[PDB]
Design a protein around this ligand. Structure first.
Ligand SMILES: Nc1ncnc2c1ncn2[C@@H]1O[C@H](CSCC[C@H](N)C(=O)O)[C@@H](O)[C@H]1O
Ligand SMILES: [Zn+2]
Ligand SMILES: [Zn+2]
Ligand SMILES: [Zn+2]
Lengths: 431, 81, 52, 55, 104
């Protein structure tokens, strides 16, 4: 397996045994309201005379405090000292190691098999206020750091793991994680622990969902490798005007944070209804009102291809195809060919002119608006088309809409042009 | 005073149910709790009112309330009984 | 893979056959989006074949 | 006596209605005798059902 | 890359069990004084007006109403537990009142 990097990872930061506080007021439980009548569990101390271990308040015991995410305090609870619900205080972390991943940098792996719901490791860091968090965030953005190291302890109180913390900062995001972060109360303080969502075996990577608030920061692509990956690291953005459509899809249409701001600012603030942030329903009026500019960047072409593969809306596809009509850069078109844009355009056709959720005249206008760039793109070999067989779809749609003769004649010209192309030679392989 | 039965607010009745050890609350129960509270208050207030009217007074005192409650088998300690 | 140095400069293959070797390497890796005129994809394919 | 003892477990030197309610409701025969009385500012004894708790 | 990881939310029941312990440990009044006083005055208005209500009478009425509601909710929780549920419904309220004899 991969070589251990535990000491090398440790040398990168100041190791902490416990959370540090900017001041004594921050991090206090109940917003600083000292519950003098501390919640004492009624458990009787169960001392095993052989091992001398107080087995009270165990995993399978009925300790009320354990269920309510509160740790027993020695000298105040009936469970006695050294009970089995002092995991944070005793710092009984699971055994873990650090290994260098292929793309994510350092990552945490389980040195032993860990049971379900077992406490893995306490997330450690400096407890800071909002202004200190903003200052440190600005400093790190100036430093160009490409790694998140902030977690929200609670409202207005954050934990920074950049310069000082624990091994938990090396845990990587997974869209189908095996662990999760939870908030617990230890004494008059609040802690953030990491617990096992399932059974984890030795050598497996330990990961948790980041559920990250960007606070307006740009999306970062997710390389977790999970099948259920959304492709980007993120979470519910700023409270309003921040997003109307998903980023890749919005940037595919040429829209950005400013154009998504402007529509909501012009109508929602002037007594016209815009729903909350939800991409399950497409607002056609926004897409129609959006401005369109030609594409000259290949990453934007990849975002366009992703939007074609994802969005089912008729109007978004109409405006993307119109933007492609404005687009005339040959390199972007070659990239779209590499991305197999014809494959996506086949489904885009099929959904609209084979399945009929719209009107025949509007579908005819769509078909005339989508045949043009197909006629215009550079093509040199039917190997390109063979990755899509879009000609079959063209035959099906000219046969279905045979009464609309301009579409039929355009598809005639298109298939005549495409049939002149040869096929790129592909070396046969032994069988 | 016009329809202040809504003054018994939803968090308050939630707290009252929570003291009884109830974990989950249905959405339709609040009108029922308001109704039964109105019925109980109606009965006790009626008995206190006729107690006061027999005493030739115009102000209901705590003694009438404790008397009415104790007559319904709901004896209250701490208010001069 | 797109760098100034070349993988095939450490072999006996003549520079006139570099595109031939990259087409062999690309076709061996079952790639289908490849086009003969795209030298970049050829270099990526041969780089992933020789140094996966 | 029972109220002073219940206060003593609460580390208090002031007898309040809470301690009186605790003393009355935690004794079987006293609960039987004072069944139909409500103690003002007495509160409720802590009681959570067994199957109400999660697993 | 200055984003913040969120602490997520609690499970349903954890904060419920917490506040159960908190309200069963503490003894303050749970009904607001002034709306309850207005409600008592509204009920008393229906029989004979110009009826002044001493503060001690209103406090005694509030204490009795809270005790009655707490007992009724304990019985209704027992009813819900008997029906293999953890959520109380109005039918359990009606059944508890029926068996208690308050409702005929
Ligand atoms: N699945 C994933 N794909 C890509 N980058 C990831 C990732 N999980 C975590 N990261 C990166 O790691 C950061 C968290 S800090 C994790 C440890 C760090 N990568 C290191 O080795 O020093 C994230 O902000 C992101 O930049
Ligand atoms: Zn315990
Ligand atoms: Zn304990
Ligand atoms: Zn992912």
């Amino acid at each position: 397996y991969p070589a251990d990097k535990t000491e090398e990872a440790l040398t990168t930061f100041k190791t902490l045994s416990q959370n540090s506080y900017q001041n004594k007021t921050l991090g206090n439980a109940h917003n600083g309201r000292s519950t003098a009548d501390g919640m004492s569990c009624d458990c009787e101390e169960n001392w095993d005379t052989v091992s001398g271990i107080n087995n009270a308040c165990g995993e399978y015991s009925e300790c009320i405090n354990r269920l309510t995410s509160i740790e027993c305090i020695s000298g105040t609870c009936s469970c006695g000292d050294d009970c089995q619900n002092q995991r944070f205080q005793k710092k009984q972390y699971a055994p873990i190691a650090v290994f260098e991943t292929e793309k994510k940098g350092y990552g945490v792996r389980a040195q032993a098999d860990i049971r379900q719901d077992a406490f893995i490791y306490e997330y450690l860091g400096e407890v800071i206020d909002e202004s200190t968090f903003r200052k440190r965030k600005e400093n790190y953005d100036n430093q160009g750091l490409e790694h998140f190291y902030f977690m929200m302890l609670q409202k207005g109180e954050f934990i920074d793991a950049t310069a000082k913390g624990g091994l938990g900062r090396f845990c990587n995001h997974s869209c189908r994680p095996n662990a999760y972060v939870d908030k617990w109360e230890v004494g008059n303080k609040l802690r953030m622990g990491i617990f096992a969502k399932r059974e984890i075996y030795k050598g497996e990577e330990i990961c948790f969902d980041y559920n990250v608030d960007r606070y307006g920061a740009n999306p970062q692509k997710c390389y977790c490798g999970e099948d259920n990956c959304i492709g980007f690291l993120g979470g519910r953005t700023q409270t309003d005007s921040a997003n109307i459509l998903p980023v890749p899809i919005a940037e595919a249409l040429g829209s950005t944070n400013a154009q998504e701001q402007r529509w909501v600012r012009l109508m929602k603030e002037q007594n016209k209804s815009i729903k909350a942030s939800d991409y399950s329903s497409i607002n056609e009026d926004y897409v129609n009102s959006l401005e369109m500019r030609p594409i000259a960047d290949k990453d934007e072409a990849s975002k366009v291809t992703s939007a074609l593969l994802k969005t089912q809306d008729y109007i978004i596809l109409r405006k993307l195809i119109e933007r492609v009509s404005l687009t005339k850069d040959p390199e972007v078109l070659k990239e779209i060919v590499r991305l197999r844009g014809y494959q996506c355009v086949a489904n885009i056709l099929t959904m609209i002119v084979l399945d009929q959720e719209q009107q025949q005249v509007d579908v005819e206008s769509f078909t005339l608006s989508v045949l043009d760039m197909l006629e215009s793109w550079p093509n040199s070999s039917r190997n390109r088309i063979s990755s899509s067989q879009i000609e079959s779809v063209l035959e099906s749609v000219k046969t279905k809409l045979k009464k609309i003769q301009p579409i039929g004649k355009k598809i005639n010209s298109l298939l005549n042009s495409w049939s002149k192309l040869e096929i790129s030679y592909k070396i046969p392989k032994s069988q | 005073l016009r329809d202040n039965i809504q003054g018994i607010t939803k968090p308050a009745i939630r707290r009252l149910a929570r003291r009884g050890g109830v974990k989950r609350i249905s959405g339709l129960i609040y009108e029922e709790t308001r109704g039964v509270l109105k019925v109980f208050l109606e009965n006790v207030i009626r008995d206190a009112v006729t107690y006061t009217e027999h005493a030739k007074r115009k102000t209901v005192t705590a003694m009438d309330v404790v008397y009415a409650l104790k007559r319904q088998g709901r004896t209250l300690y701490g208010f001069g009984g | 893979p797109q760098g100034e140095m070349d993988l095939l400069d450490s072999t006996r293959i003549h520079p006139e056959d570099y595109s031939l070797a990259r087409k062999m390497a690309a076709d061996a890796l079952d790639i289908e989006d490849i086009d003969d005129d795209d030298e970049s994809a050829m270099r990526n394919a041969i780089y992933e074949m020789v140094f996966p | 006596e029972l109220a002073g003892n219940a206060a003593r477990d609460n580390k208090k030197t002031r007898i309040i209605p809470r301690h009186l309610q605790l003393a009355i409701r935690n004794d079987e025969e006293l609960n039987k005798l004072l069944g139909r009385v409500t103690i003002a500012q007495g509160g409720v004894l802590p009681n959570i059902q067994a199957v109400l708790l999660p697993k | 890359t200055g984003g913040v990881m969120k602490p997520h939310r609690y499970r349903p029941g954890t904060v419920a069990l917490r506040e159960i312990r908190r309200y069963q440990k503490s003894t303050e009044l749970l009904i607001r004084k002034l709306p309850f006083q207005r409600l008592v005055r509204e009920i008393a208005q229906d029989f004979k007006t110009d009826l002044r209500f001493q503060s001690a009478a209103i406090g005694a009425l509030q204490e009795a109403s809270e005790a009655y509601l707490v007992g009724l909710f304990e019985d209704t929780n027992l009813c819900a537990i008997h029906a293999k549920r953890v959520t109380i419904m109005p039918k359990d309220i009606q059944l508890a009142r029926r068996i208690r004899g308050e409702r005929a």
